[PDB]
């Protein structure tokens, strides 16, 4: 064992003789292909979202280059890995959104959408004809009761509710950092939560962005309606880290 | 960045570095084929294709790598050309669909989402195989403006100012970032592009070539429709001229 | 090494195909012979035991009255075959009230050539070629006719022709005796010499099996003492 | 649905499946066939003897109807598969016909579904052989054989499974018009061929008889044990006051 | 455009063995522990809920899920499975609802489950589940204790122990434990024999523990947890 | 050797092999040649023939009045491809009483043959066909490949040897849209005859003529009825 | 696809299934499982793997599957197989009850499902059931009966078999002792005993070991008895009374 | 059938009558209409008994399903259009008549739903055969913001004014209160409905009834 191999079970979402799923990890390392990272945080009143906005060349209408996806006036994700497939389950979690609220009457609650995407990959995971999504999806929004909700979930099936997470290259280190920020104890209000997020992928990548190479996504309680930060914001969000 | 052990016979397999090497495959058949770019300014968008001829016995205009998608909009395929063709069938399907369903002429970047999920439905099974061909939509309107969008084997879609696909793919962009389009009209434009494809051509390697051109915009009314033979010549004219110096 | 059934060669053949035409160099030989007065078929029993009853062994049917056919190779495939023609012939004269042409039939057999697949099929659908060469000897507007099937579905006409292991040197054989304006004596005569040839065994009438299609005659079996006959004029 | 060829072609034009189901055939329990004037036998070797086994549920001669009836060798599995649809065709054939059953006919529709199955995604061929045996209205007797590749053909008589060229050779050698010249000696004429490849003893030997517009006839061990003592008797009244 | 595979993906080896599935036992063999035990006038389950950070937010996902009102579930091994067994479990018991009017036999259940998990063990294109799955339910006045596993066998429990270190939890239980035990007292020995493993401070977030008796299913609040983790209570 | 067997599997170098293998069955059958003045279409088409007696494999099939092929390569997926144009024809006569325009035709066989390229367990079509036809813009002839790829030709051979026929046809392409009907068919009957050894030449038993034009529905020519178009031919000595 | 295909329903080139066999590999390494036919009764025995401190047990059984109210079976191999295979004998039981209004024929049971089994083997792709089994009954047919079947479809009634673990020396031994026509469920039983106590690995044999059931006649009705592990302990003794018995002659 | 509901302060007051028919026959005098859906929700069903039954039946398991995964209580909404999506797609052939009550974290929410699937939100509601009585004394007795009872009495009320004044309707008046931390399932309320004391004693003694045959079979 450690590390055997038999049949197919590095081929297809089969078992590998210590009981493990190859094809599985594998999308986990095809995420990291994209070259990008991403960081989530939970704030005391909001949920920010945070991304590297690599556009290397001019030819593109920077317009159209975002991996902030609205999927309901009030729920917001972030994606990372593979691109066309990280749309596919956009696309996905968009149409469970809308039936739900058709067949229930209420909106759905980030907690079960991410449960039912997560679901739906699970079965990826166990049928041999397709394989795993080489995309990852982190959730944000206001729930009615829980206060503001970040969850996340993996080409695995995994699914999980977080108070700040992290996906892509610099994903451990900015755990790390995130995990160091939160044991502290400080007023987790909203520029605490933009400035928190915003300086850990600034120090996990070293960078001090500028403002066209992120983009900020947000939720807050008085305002649940999913907010992405236009550049001239982000850059007031920027300016005000140079101080102290 | 060259792994083929198995790990390369099927789309619904990963290889253990997280890589799916048949769309790379596919994307590779793209780099093969004869360039073809597009490029958008202020009042639309042009398209010009390098068309390798293969024989003397072929008529004019055989083998279009220019589609009509829809009456407002425009494609431009590279790779493997049957494979396009059904992709500008798709294309057609999506718009009529659209139309028929909800009244007008489809946005652009729906379109583009459309097909572009279709192409990607590609990548996850072992039962099919993904599309041999990137293709760019191009389309004018004065409600959403003018706009191009390009899709590759993975089904990826995005919006540019300028884009080029093929062989000589950096040289052309490297090409086209020299002009200035946000400022131009496609009429200054489609000089540009058929010098950019005179530029691009390797005569040595390839031989004779043919070259094609496509309006859309506010000098077509919104109609994607073919360069005139007036118009080409004088482009293809102004190439040649360029091409000495 | 396993491979679909549906696949190429790099010379651009289908292998399950060839692979069929091989298989039919097994079969028993037969023969044809196209004549102004009729059409013949000559082929051999190949009996493996005196305890087999030959009678129970026909490699020439009858698809229509005017129309017969002698196989080679798989017999249970040809079978198959075989029954589909006989109902195409019933279905054409339902219909139109009048026999169908020799070729048409033959057409029609051949429609069911590359109708073989594993996915996007139906779950009634052939897996395999059919291992089988067919000649076909009718009567119709056009006069006598003779065509011959092998399992790349490819028909053609033919005034003398040869299929079976000994396929080569009977028709070569057959070749040297051939002109368009020989008697159906002369091609019944040649037909069972050239098998008596090319059979392992002693030639006699209960041995091989041979059947006429003239104009003013409907298709004809040979009996024991019919083939006698011919035999004596050895 | 599974939808895979699993019979194919081979380079040296082989349907190597088929082959296989052959040799499976090969390995089965003999089984031996003859046809007389008025009576046609058919009899089995070895009823895997274990005595602690029920005979009865074993038995590898069935009924198809009244008018027919059929041993086997092969996979006994696939032999019950083969004979109750061979079974639900006979009557179905009185359904849509008035008339009965011929041997032939329902001989052609068994071949020709052992060859679909050569011939179908997903299936397998049947690994049996069978020995059809009747008597056709118009009261002319025959035995017919069947084959994993769904050929079929008239005998006079036969044998299959395990060393069936011998008994094959054995009963070239010694079918006349005068054995099977009475029912009496076509049974022995069976019985004979079967104590050729058998473990010699009587007590492994099956034996079914069918005759005229009358039921199959099973035999039980205490007459097959009579037949091979007048068998002995003969092979000592004959061959010991001779050699 | 898809269809799917619709050989078998667990097959028997020349020994005799269906590898697949013990590839799934495996991966069980593998998973966070789980401990159940049946007391007379009750049942507990009680596994490791230990996270990889203090990130993760600990009161979103459950391993110790409820079917109904009178059944719950905990797993060793792969959790996206045990989900979706979870959410099959809870439709069973529904339809069985629905067809009797009456709150489904803990055995019953055990039973179509296990029935669903050895479908996967044939059917075409997929492999087993990688779950071990622990019953417990209240019915006909007795309580209950189950145990599936990929195979889609089960087997009645007095008491066990699944996951890591699973044989030492197992004999540590065959020792340390047996019947005419209160509900409290087995709550007592299933931390202590979870304990047994957990490598770290044990916390009140930190395992997970649920409870059988004739009132219905429930999960223990964290605060419950944490007065039984005082050593006492 | 891997990159093979499946239509599905991409090559790592961006080819698909069982495509070009498929192309492979195009060269094995006999020659044939088709060309267009402004006037007419015309195919010619070189027969072949097993052994002396047997008749010379037909290469030419009527699919409209107005449209007509000529195969090459597996006969079985001609009559298959034939059948469909047949019935496309059909369906716009009966729709809306007008012929199918010949480029629409070809399009929707391009259509059709793409599907099976890209399926798992399917195969391309193992056949190339020379299309001549006639409408509202004139005559035309099509190239159509197993790689469901299509051509608009001003004149084209495709087959065994017909790389010659090619390079004739390259030649004399210029003489073509003024010929009458009868230098047309010679022109086409001379592609086909560089295609043969000096040893061997055209016959009234080996060579099927096809025309469509403004004045002529499609129409096959065989046996005598060819013999006008050969006995007008120069005797191309070696 | 087309390489992932394990091909589980086709020939080998000696002309056998490979699937089937190799679940008969399965099927030796599983609980020794006999059965014995007497003249009023029959009796199934079999060897229980579900042996620890903690069991619970909640059934009647472990390997004893009530079928009909005439009609009993065990197995031996895979037991989820097992599970799926009984609940369509029950299936096909109840079908015929339903049709004819009388109790379905042993018989036309096991070739029921039999037919099933072999249906696996020939076509779908799927790998066989593995699983043997053997049924005790009675009918108005052929009174008491005893029959087998494998993962092949292929079944055969028997007076006396075993099945499992160690199945051959079983049958060597019911060989010697049986007694054709002179068989009772009292020496049945005692032969049960005696051939379990040798094939089972773990000698002295506990009740905590063993399962017997019989099936009898009483009054019209047909009886399904699982032994209470008492008599289980009586019938031990017994044995081991009578072999010490016979040991003292020397 | 009478069936009533109401919203008060507090909550929300359903009723029912208790009478079941069989044509003009009474079968049942003591009929349960008053059905649970979840903890929180509860439904009032006339129309055909065996469709309101199913129905019902049907949306609390589904519920329950949606509970059970969602770890919260059920909405009202929820309940709302799963019912009335089902009864629309059958057009009307599933008699499925409805008062739908419960409290929410939105609060307390009535709703009418008919078998065709048409619902509506209304503070007070009525259905059945004796529904125009109740509504009547609900359009002359009912005010906003009741104290719970005063809802109680104006419920029964209307029930009563149904059982006293339809055929369909009779014998006793079931409540069911649901406030935002209690739940009254108050079954019956009160029977203002009595069969007089028999006036005779009809009972027949032992041997009255000749017997042919007779068959005694021993149990266990």
């Not at chain 2, 002429?105 to 061909?133: E, Q, W």
């Not at chain 5, 401990?35 to 507990?44: E, L």
């Not at chain 5, 007795?142 to 044989?167: C, E, H, I």
């Amino acid at each position: 064992s450690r590390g055997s191999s038999a049949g197919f079970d590095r081929h297809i979402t089969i078992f590998s003789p210590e009981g493990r799923l190859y094809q599985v990890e594998y999308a986990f390392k095809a995420i990291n292909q994209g070259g990008l990272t991403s960081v989530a945080v939970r704030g005391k009143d909001c949920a920010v979202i945070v991304t590297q906005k690599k556009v290397p060349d001019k030819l593109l209408d920077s317009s159209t280059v975002t991996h902030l996806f609205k999927i309901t006036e009030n729920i917001g994700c972030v994606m990372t890995g593979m691109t066309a497939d990280s749309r596919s389950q956009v696309q996905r979690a968009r149409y469970e959104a809308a039936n739900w609220k058709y067949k229930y009457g209420y909106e759905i609650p980030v907690d079960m959408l991410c449960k039912r995407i997560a679901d739906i990959s699970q079965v990826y995971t166990q049928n041999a004809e397709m394989r795993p999504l080489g995309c990852c999806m982190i959730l944000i929004g206001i729930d009615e009761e829980q206060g503001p909700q970040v969850y996340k979930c993996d080409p695995a099936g995994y699914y999980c509710g977080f108070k700040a997470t992290a996906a892509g290259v610099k994903q451990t280190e900015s755990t790390s950092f995130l995990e160091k920020k939160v044991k502290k104890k400080f007023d987790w209000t909203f520029e605490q939560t933009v400035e928190t997020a915003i300086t850990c992928l600034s120090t996990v990548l070293s960078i001090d962005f500028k403002p066209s190479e992120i983009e900020v996504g947000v939720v807050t309680v008085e305002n649940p309606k999913f907010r992405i930060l236009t550049e001239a914001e982000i850059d007031a969000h920027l300016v005000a880290l140079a101080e102290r | 960045s060259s792994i083929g052990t198995g790990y390369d016979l099927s789309a619904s397999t990963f290889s253990p570095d997280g890589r799916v090497f048949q769309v790379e495959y596919a994307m590779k058949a793209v780099e093969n084929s004869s360039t073809a770019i597009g490029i958008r300014c202020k009042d639309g968008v042009v398209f010009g294709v390098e068309k390798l001829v293969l024989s003397k016995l072929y008529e004019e205009g055989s083998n279009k790598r220019l589609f009509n998608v829809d009456r407002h909009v425009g494609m431009a395929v590279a790779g493997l050309l049957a494979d396009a063709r059904s992709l500008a069938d798709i294309a057609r399907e999506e718009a009529s669909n659209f139309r028929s369903n909800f009244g007008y002429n489809i946005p652009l970047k729906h379109l583009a989402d459309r097909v572009a999920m279709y192409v990607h439905a590609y990548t996850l099974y072992s039962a099919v195989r993904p599309f041999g061909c990137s293709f760019m939509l191009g389309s004018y309107s004065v409600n959403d403006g003018a706009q191009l969008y390009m899709i590759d084997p993975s089904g990826v879609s995005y919006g540019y100012w300028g884009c080029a696909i093929g062989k000589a793919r950096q040289a052309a962009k490297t090409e086209i970032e020299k002009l200035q389009m946000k400022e131009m009209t496609c009429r200054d434009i489609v000089k540009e592009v058929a010098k950019i494809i005179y530029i691009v051509h390797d005569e040595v390697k390839d031989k004779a070539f043919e070259l094609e051109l496509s309006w859309v915009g506010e000098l077509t009314n919104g109609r994607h429709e073919i360069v005139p033979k007036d118009i080409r010549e004088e482009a293809e004219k102004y190439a040649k001229e360029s091409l000495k110096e | 090494y396993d491979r679909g059934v549906n696949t190429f060669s790099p010379e651009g053949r289908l292998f399950q195909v060839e692979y069929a035409i091989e298989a039919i160099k097994l079969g028993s030989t037969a023969i044809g012979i196209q004549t102004s007065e009729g059409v013949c078929l000559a082929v051999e029993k190949r009996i493996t035991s005196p305890l087999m009853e030959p009678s129970s062994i026909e490699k020439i049917v009858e698809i229509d009255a005017h129309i017969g056919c002698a196989m080679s190779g798989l017999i249970a495939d040809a079978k198959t075959l075989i029954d589909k023609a006989r109902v195409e012939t019933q279905n054409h004269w339902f219909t139109y009230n009048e026999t169908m042409t020799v070729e048409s039939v033959t057409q029609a057999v051949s429609n069911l050539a590359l109708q073989f697949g594993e996915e996007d099929a139906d779950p009634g659908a052939m897996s395999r070629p059919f291992g089988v060469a067919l000649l076909f000897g009718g009567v119709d507007e056009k006069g006598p006719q003779l065509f011959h099937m092998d399992p790349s579905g490819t028909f053609v006409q033919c005034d003398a022709r040869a299929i079976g292991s000994a396929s080569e040197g009977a028709q070569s054989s057959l070749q040297e005796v051939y002109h368009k304006s020989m008697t159906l004596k002369e091609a019944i005569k040649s037909s069972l010499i050239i098998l008596k040839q090319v059979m392992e065994e002693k030639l006699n009438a209960t041995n091989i099996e041979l059947a006429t299609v003239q104009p003013g005659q409907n298709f004809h079996m040979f009996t024991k003492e019919e083939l006698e006959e011919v035999i004596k004029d050895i | 649905s599974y939808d895979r060829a699993i019979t194919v072609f081979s380079p040296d034009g082989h349907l190597f499946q088929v082959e296989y189901a052959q040799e499976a055939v090969k390995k089965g329990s003999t089984a031996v066939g003859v046809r007389g004037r008025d009576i046609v036998v058919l009899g089995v070797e070895k009823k895997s003897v274990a005595k602690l086994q029920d005979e009865r549920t074993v038995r590898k001669i069935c009924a198809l109807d009244d008018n027919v009836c059929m041993a086997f060798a092969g996979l006994t599995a696939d032999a019950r598969i083969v004979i109750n649809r061979a079974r639900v065709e006979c009557q179905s054939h009185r359904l849509t016909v008035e008339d009965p059953v011929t041997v032939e006919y329902i001989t052609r529709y068994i071949a020709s579904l052992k060859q679909r199955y050569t011939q179908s995604n997903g299936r397998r061929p049947f690994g049996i052989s069978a020995l059809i045996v009747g008597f056709d209205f118009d009261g002319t007797p025959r035995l017919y054989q069947t084959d994993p590749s769904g050929t079929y053909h008239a005998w006079k008589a036969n044998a299959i499974g395990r060393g069936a060229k011998s008994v094959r050779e054995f009963l070239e050698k010694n079918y006349t018009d005068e054995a099977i010249e009475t029912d009496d000696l076509t049974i022995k004429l069976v019985i004979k061929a079967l104590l050729e490849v058998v473990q010699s003893g009587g007590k492994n030997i099956e034996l079914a008889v069918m005759r005229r517009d009358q039921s199959l006839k099973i035999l039980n061990p205490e007459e097959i044990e009579k037949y091979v003592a007048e068998i002995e008797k003969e092979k000592e009244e004959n061959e010991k006051k001779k050699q | 455009a898809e269809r799917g595979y619709s050989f078998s993906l667990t097959t028997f080896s020349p020994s005799g063995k269906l590898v697949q599935i013990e590839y799934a036992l495996a991966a069980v063999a593998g998973g966070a522990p789980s401990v159940g035990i049946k007391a007379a006038n009750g049942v507990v389950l009680a596994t490791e809920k230990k996270q990889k950070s203090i990130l993760y937010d600990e009161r979103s996902v459950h391993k110790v899920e409820p079917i109904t009102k009178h059944i719950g579930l905990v797993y060793s091994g792969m959790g996206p499975d045990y989900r979706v067994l979870v959410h099959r479990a809870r439709k069973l018991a529904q339809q069985y609802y629905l067809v009797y009017q009456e709150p489904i036999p803990t055995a019953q259940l055990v039973q179509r489950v296990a029935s669903v998990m050895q479908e996967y063990t044939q059917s075409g294109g997929v492999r087993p589940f990688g779950v071990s799955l622990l019953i417990c339910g209240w019915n006909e006045g007795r309580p209950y204790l189950f145990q599936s596993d990929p195979s889609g066998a089960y087997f009645a429990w007095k008491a066990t122990a699944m996951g890591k270190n699973y044989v030492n939890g197992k004999t540590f239980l065959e020792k340390r434990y047996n019947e005419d035990l209160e509900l409290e007292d087995a709550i007592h020995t299933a931390i202590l024999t979870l304990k047994e493993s957990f490598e770290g401070q044990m916390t009140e977030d930190n395992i997970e523990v649920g409870i059988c008796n004739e009132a219905g299913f429930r999960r223990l609040t964290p605060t419950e947890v944490k007065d039984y983790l005082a050593a006492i209570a | 050797n891997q990159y093979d067997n499946d239509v599905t599997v991409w090559s790592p170098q961006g080819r698909i092999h069982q495509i070009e293998y498929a192309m492979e069955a195009v060269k094995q059958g006999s020659a044939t040649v088709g060309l267009k003045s402004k006037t007419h279409a015309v195919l010619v088409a070189l027969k072949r023939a097993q052994s002396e007696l047997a008749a010379h494999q037909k290469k030419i099939l009527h699919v409209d009045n107005h449209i007509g092929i000529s195969i090459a390569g597996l006969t079985a997926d001609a009559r298959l491809l034939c059948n469909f144009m047949r019935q496309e024809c059909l369906d716009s006569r009966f729709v809306f009483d007008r012929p199918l325009p010949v480029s629409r035709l070809v399009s929707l066989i391009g259509s059709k043959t793409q599907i099976p390229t890209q399926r798992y367990g399917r195969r391309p079509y193992g056949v190339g066909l020379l299309i001549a036809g006639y409408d509202d813009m004139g005559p035309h002839i099509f190239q159509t490949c197993p790689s469901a790829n299509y051509f608009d030709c001003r004149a084209m051979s495709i087959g065994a040897r017909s790389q010659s026929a090619r390079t004739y046809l390259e030649r004399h392409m210029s003489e073509f849209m003024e010929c009458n009907l009868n230098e047309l068919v010679k022109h086409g009957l001379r592609a086909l005859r560089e295609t043969l050894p000096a040893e061997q030449d055209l016959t009234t038993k080996n060579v099927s003529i096809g025309i469509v034009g403004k004045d002529l529905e499609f129409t096959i020519y065989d046996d005598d009825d060819v013999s006008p178009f050969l006995e007008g031919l120069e005797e191309r000595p070696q | 696809s087309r390489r992932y295909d394990s091909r589980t329903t086709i020939f080998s080139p000696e002309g056998r299934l490979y699937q089937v066999e190799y679940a008969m590999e399965a099927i030796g390494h599983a609980g020794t499982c006999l059965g014995i036919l007497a003249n009023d009764g029959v009796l199934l025995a079999a060897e229980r793997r579900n042996i620890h401190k903690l069991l619970d047990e909640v059934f009647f059984s472990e390997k004893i599957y009530k079928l009909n109210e005439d009609m009993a079976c065990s197995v031996a191999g895979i037991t989820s197989d097992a599970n799926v295979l009984t609940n369509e004998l029950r299936l096909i039981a109840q079908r015929y009850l339903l049709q004819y209004q009388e109790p379905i024929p042993c018989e036309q049971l096991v070739t029921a499902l039999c037919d099933i089994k072999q249906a696996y083997t020939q076509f779908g792709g799927k790998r066989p059931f593995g699983v043997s089994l053997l049924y005790i009954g009675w009918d108005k047919h052929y009174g008491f009966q005893l029959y087998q079947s494998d993962p092949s479809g292929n079944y055969g009634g028997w007076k006396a078999t075993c099945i499992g673990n160690n199945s051959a020396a079983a049958v060597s031994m019911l060989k010697q002792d049986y007694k054709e026509g002179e068989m009772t469920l009292k020496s049945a039983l005692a032969l049960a005993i005696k051939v379990l106590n040798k094939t089972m690995d773990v000698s002295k044999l506990s009740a905590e070991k063993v399962e017997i059931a019989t099936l009898t006649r009483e009054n019209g009705k047909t009886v399904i008895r699982v032994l209470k592990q008492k008599e289980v302990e009586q019938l031990i003794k017994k044995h081991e009374e009578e072999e010490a018995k016979a040991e003292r002659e020397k | 059938t009478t069936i009533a509901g109401v919203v008060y302060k507090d909550g929300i007051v359903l009723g029912a009558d208790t009478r079941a028919t069989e044509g003009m026959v009474v079968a049942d005098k003591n009929c349960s209409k008053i059905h649970f859906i979840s903890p929180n929700i509860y439904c009032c069903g006339a129309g055909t008994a065996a469709d309101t039954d199913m129905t019902t039946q049907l949306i609390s398991s589904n519920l329950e399903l949606h509970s059970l995964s969602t770890g919260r209580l059920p909405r009202v909404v929820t309940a709302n259009r799963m019912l009335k999506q089902m009864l629309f797609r059958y057009q009307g052939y599933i008699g499925a008549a409805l008062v739908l009550g419960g409290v929410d974290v939105t609060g307390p929410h009535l709703y009418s739903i008919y078998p065709h699937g048409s619902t509506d939100k209304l503070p007070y509601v009525t259905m059945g055969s004796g529904s125009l009585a109740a509504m009547a004394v609900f359009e002359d007795k009912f005010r906003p913001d009741m104290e719970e009872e005063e809802a109680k009495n104006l419920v029964s009320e209307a029930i009563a004014a149904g059982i006293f004044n339809d055929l369909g309707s009779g014998s006793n008046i079931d409540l069911c209160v649901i406030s935002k931390n209690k739940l009254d399932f108050l079954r019956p309320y009160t029977v203002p409905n009595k069969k007089g004391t028999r006036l005779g004693r009809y009972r027949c003694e032992k041997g009255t009834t000749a017997v042919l045959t007779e068959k005694i079979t021993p149990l266990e």
